[PDB]
Amino acid sequence: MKGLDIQKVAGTWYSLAMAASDISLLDAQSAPLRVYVEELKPTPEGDLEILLQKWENGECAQKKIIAEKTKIPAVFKIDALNENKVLVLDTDYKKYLLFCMENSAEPEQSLACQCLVRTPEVDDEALEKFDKALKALPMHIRLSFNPTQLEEQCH
């Protein structure tokens, strides 16, 4: 996607759907890449704070990741445990956001994608765009959640 206005993706988001290239990365509620985005907050430094949930050590834990802008407008660099690049595939700011995360050292084995939406409702158009994008990427696991799970901690 050509260009991102960070100010315009601020606020609450819900992880409506996920997909990954390796099954074991989303294989469990405690799988390494099973993360639920909650809020995107621009920082005074111009970076993007990501508030998300992850099942860790037997509890739903909050994690804070900083996405720094790069020379490519849709690509960010995150200091995270298992991923280091986030690519925003598509967004309308107002309804949905499609992104992918990967570890640049192992791009194929680490690729995961998510469909984020602004409200805890099944956005069929967002899921259609997400599936169309996934058609061209080597995904072997796909997960989708219902609004009740979307309103629960760690779904």
Q: Does 27 bind a second copy (CB under 8 A)?
A: yes
69 binds, among ligand SDS, a second copy, none (CB under 5 to 8 A by kind): none
Side chain identity, residue 63:
K
Q: Does 96 bind ligand SDS (CB under 6 A)?
A: no
Q: Does 87 bind a second copy (CB under 8 A)?
A: no
Residue from the set 8, 146, 151, 152 that interacts with a second copy by CB under 8 A:
146
Shortest Cβ 62–a second copy spacing (Å): 21
- b/e burial code for range 119-152 (CB count within 10 A of at least 16 → b): ebeebeebbebbeebbeeeebebeeebeeeebee
Residue from the set 20, 36, 83, 123 that interacts with ligand SDS by CB under 6 A:
83
146 binds, among a second copy, ligand SDS, none (CB under 5 to 8 A by kind): a second copy
Q: Does 43 bind a second copy (CB under 8 A)?
A: no
Q: Does 150 bind a second copy (CB under 8 A)?
A: no
Site residues (CB under 6 A) for ligand SDS?
Answer: 9, 23-24, 27-29, 31-33, 35, 37, 40, 48, 50, 52, 63, 65, 67, 76, 78, 80-83, 86, 88, 97, 99, 101, 149, 155
Site residues (CB under 8 A) for a second copy?
Answer: 23, 27-29, 139-146
